[PDB]
Amino acid sequence: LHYPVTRQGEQVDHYFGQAVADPYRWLEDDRSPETEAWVKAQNAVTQDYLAQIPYRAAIKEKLAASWNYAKEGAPFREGRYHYFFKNDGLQNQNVLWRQQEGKPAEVFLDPNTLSPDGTTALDQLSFSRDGRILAYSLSLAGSDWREIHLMDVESKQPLETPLKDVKFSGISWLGNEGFFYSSYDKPDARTDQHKVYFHRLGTAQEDDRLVFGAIPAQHHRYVGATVTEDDRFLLISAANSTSGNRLYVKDLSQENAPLLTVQGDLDADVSLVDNKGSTLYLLTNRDAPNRRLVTVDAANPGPAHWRDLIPERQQVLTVHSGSGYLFAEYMVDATARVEQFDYEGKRVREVALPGLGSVSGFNGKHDDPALYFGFENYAQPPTLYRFEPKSGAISLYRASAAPFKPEDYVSEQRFYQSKDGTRVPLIISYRKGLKLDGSNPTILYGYGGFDVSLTPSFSVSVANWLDLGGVYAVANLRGGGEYGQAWHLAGTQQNKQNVFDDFIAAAEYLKAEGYTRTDRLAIRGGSNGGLLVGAVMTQRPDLMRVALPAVGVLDMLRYHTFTAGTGWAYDYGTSADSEAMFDYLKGYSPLHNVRPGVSYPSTMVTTADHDDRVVPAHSFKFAATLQADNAGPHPQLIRIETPVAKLIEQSADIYAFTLYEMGYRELPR
Numbered sequence: 001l002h003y004p005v006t007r008q009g010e011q012v013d014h015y016f017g018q019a020v021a022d023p024y025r026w027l028e029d030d031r032s033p034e035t036e037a038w039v040k041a042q043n044a045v046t047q048d049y050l051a052q053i054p055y056r057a058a059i060k061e062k063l064a065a066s067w068n069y070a071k072e073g074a075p076f077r078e079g080r081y082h083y084f085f086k087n088d089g090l091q092n093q094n095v096l097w098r099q100q101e102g103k104p105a106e107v108f109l110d111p112n113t114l115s116p117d118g119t120t121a122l123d124q125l126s127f128s129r130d131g132r133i134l135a136y137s138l139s140l141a142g143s144d145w146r147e148i149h150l151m152d153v154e155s156k157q158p159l160e161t162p163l164k165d166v167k168f169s170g171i172s173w174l175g176n177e178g179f180f181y182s183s184y185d186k187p188d189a190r191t192d193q194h195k196v197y198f199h200r201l202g203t204a205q206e207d208d209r210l211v212f213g214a215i216p217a218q219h220h221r222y223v224g225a226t227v228t229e230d231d232r233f234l235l236i237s238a239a240n241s242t243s244g245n246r247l248y249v250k251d252l253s254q255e256n257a258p259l260l261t262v263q264g265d266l267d268a269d270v271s272l273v274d275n276k277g278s279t280l281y282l283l284t285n286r287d288a289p290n291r292r293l294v295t296v297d298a299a300n301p302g303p304a305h306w307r308d309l310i311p312e313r314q315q316v317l318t319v320h321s322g323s324g325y326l327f328a329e330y331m332v333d334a335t336a337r338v339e340q341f342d343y344e345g346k347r348v349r350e351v352a353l354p355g356l357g358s359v360s361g362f363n364g365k366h367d368d369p370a371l372y373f374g375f376e377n378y379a380q381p382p383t384l385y386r387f388e389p390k391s392g393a394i395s396l397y398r399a400s401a402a403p404f405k406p407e408d409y410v411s412e413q414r415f416y417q418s419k420d421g422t423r424v425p426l427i428i429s430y431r432k433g434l435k436l437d438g439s440n441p442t443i444l445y446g447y448g449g450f451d452v453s454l455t456p457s458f459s460v461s462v463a464n465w466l467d468l469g470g471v472y473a474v475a476n477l478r479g480g481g482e483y484g485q486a487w488h489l490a491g492t493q494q495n496k497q498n499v500f501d502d503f504i505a506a507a508e509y510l511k512a513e514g515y516t517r518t519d520r521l522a523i524r525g526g527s528n529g530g531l532l533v534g535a536v537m538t539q540r541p542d543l544m545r546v547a548l549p550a551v552g553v554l555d556m557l558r559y560h561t562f563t564a565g566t567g568w569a570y571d572y573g574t575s576a577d578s579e580a581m582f583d584y585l586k587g588y589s590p591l592h593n594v595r596p597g598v599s600y601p602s603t604m605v606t607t608a609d610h611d612d613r614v615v616p617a618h619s620f621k622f623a624a625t626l627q628a629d630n631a632g633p634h635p636q637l638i639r640i641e642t643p644v645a646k647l648i649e650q651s652a653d654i655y656a657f658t659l660y661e662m663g664y665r666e667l668p669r
Contacts (some may be wrong), residue, residue, distance in 0.1 A: 037619075439517065447528055448499035
C-alpha cells in the first residue's frame with residue numbers, strides 16, 4: 001500500500017513528570033487545511049483499495065434491495081374505528097390509517113403531506129374519550145415548540161384554531177370536555193417555569209385555566225399531567241431534570257378537590273401506571289434501584305403509605321397495563337421476559353414469548369378484547385403478535401415485510417467464562433445449517449460501558465452478513481447495564497481491563513467452540529466500542545484477522561480535553577486525576593499502545609470528518625500511528641465520512657473489506 005505521508009511534529013506532553021510524545025497533535029484540529037487535505041488523501045487510498053474487491057458491488061446491491069421495507073403497528077380502538085400506523089418503506093413519517101366495521105382501511109392522517117420537505121412532524125396524539133375528536137401536536141425543523149391541533153374525526157376537518165406555545169408537553173383528556181397540556185407561557189417574557197393548563201373545547205386558548213406551576217411553591221422546569229383512563233384522577237408530575245420528580249394527585253370525582261402530595265421531594269422517580277377505584281398503582285425507584293410497583297390510596301398518597309404490589313427484583317422492572325391486567329417486563333440475561341399479573345398482585349402466568357429478544361407493546365385500554373406486542377432479535381425482523389389475556393394464547397398478527405425468511409436463521413445464547421472466572425452472556429446468530437467446523441466468517445461485537453445494555457434488535461445490515469455465511473456474535477461485557485450497578489462499575493476506571501478481558505475471552509470461546517478461527521474472525525465496536533476494538537487489537541493483535549473500530553475514543557490521555565470529552569469521565573477517569581489513574585489509562589490507551597514492528601490485523605477505522613460527540617482527532621491519530629508502526633502486510637485504513645444511501649455504502653465497504661481481508665476471492669461458500 002501507498003499510504004499518504006503523515007507529518008510528525010515535536011509536541012511532547014507531560015503527566016506527573018512523565019513525558020509523552022504526540023507527533024500527530026496537529027490532526028486534532030479537524031478543520032485546519034492540513035488536516036482536511038490529509039482526510040482527502042486517506043479517503044483516496046481507502047477507496048482505491050476497496051475498488052479492487054470483486055464482490056463489493058454485489059454486496060452493496062443486496063443491501064440496497066433489502067434495506068427499505070413496509071412496516072405496520074398494532075391496531076387501537078377509538079370510537080367506532082381501529083387505527084394503526086403504517087410506513088411504506090420510503091415515507092419519512094409513519095402514516096395513521098383507519099378501518100371501520102366492514103370497509104377497507106383508509107389513510108387518516110399523513111404527516112408527510114404537512115409540508116414540502118416534510119419538516120413538519122407529528123409528535124403527540126390523543127383522542128377524546130369518545131374517540132370523536134383528535135388532539136395532536138406538531139413540531140417544526142428542530143424547534144422544541146409545538147402547536148396542538150384539534151380535528152373532528154368524522155369530517156377530518158379542524159375543530160378549532162391550534163394551540164400555540166406548547167413545549168415538552170403531553171396531551172391528556174378529561175372525558176370529552178377538554179385536555180391538559182404544558183407550556184412555559186400564559187395563554188393570552190419567557191421563563192423556565194413550566195405550567196399545566198387545561199383547554200376546554202369550545203373556548204379560546206387565552207381563556208385556558210392555570211392548573212399548576214405559577215405560584216413560587218410550584219415552580220419547576222418540567223411539569224406533566226395525566227388523567228386516568230376512568231377520568232377519576234389527575235396526576236401532575238413536576239421535575240427540574242431527568243432525575244427525580246414530585247407527584248401530585250387530584251380527585252376529579254370530587255368538587256373543588258385539593259392536590260394531595262404523592263411524593264413531595266425529588267429523591268426518586270415515580271409515575272402513574274393506573275388506578276383501580278381509589279387505589280393508585282405507581283412505578284417507582286424510591287428505595288428500589290431496579291424499580292418496584294406499589295399501591296397507595298389516593299386519599300393519603302405519601303411514600304410512607306406505599307405498599308409493594310410487585311416487589312423489586314434483581315432485574316429492572318418496566319410495567320405495562322391492558323385488558324384489566326398488569327404486565328411486568330424484565331431484562332433477564334439481556335433479553336425480555338414478560339409476566340402477567342392481575343390488579344390484586346397475583347401472578348397469572350409468564351407470557352410465552354417467541355424466543356429470546358426484545359419486546360414492545362402489551363399496552364391497552366381496560367376493555368380491550370386483546371393486546372398486541374412486538375418481538376424481534378438479531379435473527380428475526382420486527383413481528384406483531386396478538387395476545388389473548390384470559391387464556392394467554394398467542395398468534396402471529398403481522399409478519400415482517402423485511403425480505404428475510406425467519407425460519408432460515410437461528411440465534412442462541414451462550415455463557416462463557418472470562419479471565420477471572422466471571423460468566424458472560426454471548427448471543428450468536430447465523431443462517432440455519434452452519435457447521436461448527438471453525439471456518440465461519442465471524443464478527444464479534446461488544447460495547448462494555450456506561451451502563452448500556454446490549455439487547456437484541458433486528459438490523460438489515462446484520463441480516464445481510466448472515467446471508468453471506470457470516471456469524472454475528474454479541475457479547476454482554478462488564479461495564480454495561482445487563483446486571484445492575486456492579487456489572488457497570490466492574491468495567492470503570494481502574495477496572496476497565498475487565499471489559500477487554502471479557503471481550504478477549506469471547507473471541508477465544510468462539511474459536512474453542514468451533515464457530516470460527518483466527519483468520520475468519522473480525523471484531524467490531526463503536527465509540528466506547530471503538531475503544532474496545534482499539535484496546536483489544538493493541539493488546540492482542542494476534543487474536544483476530546480484521547479490526548473495525550468506529551468513532552472510537554482512542555487517545556485516552558487527552559479525550560477529556562476535547563469537545564464533549566468531560567461526559568466520558570465518570571466511566572474512564574482522566575490523566576489528570578492522579579498518577580495512578582494516569583498510569584492505568586496510559587496502560588491501555590490504544591493510541592499510546594500501538595508499537596513499531598508489531599504486525600496488526602487488517603483494520604478499517606471509520607469516523608465522520610467533523611463530529612462533536614467523539615472528535616475525529618481520535619480516529620485520525622490512531623490511523624496515522626497504525627500506518628507508521630505496522631510491520632506486517634495487512635492494510636491499516638481509515639474511511640472518513642464527509643442518508644440511507646450513505647449507510648448502505650458504509651455497510652457494503654465494511655463487509656466487502658472484511659471478507660476480502662479474510663482471503664475470499666469470491667463470496668463465501
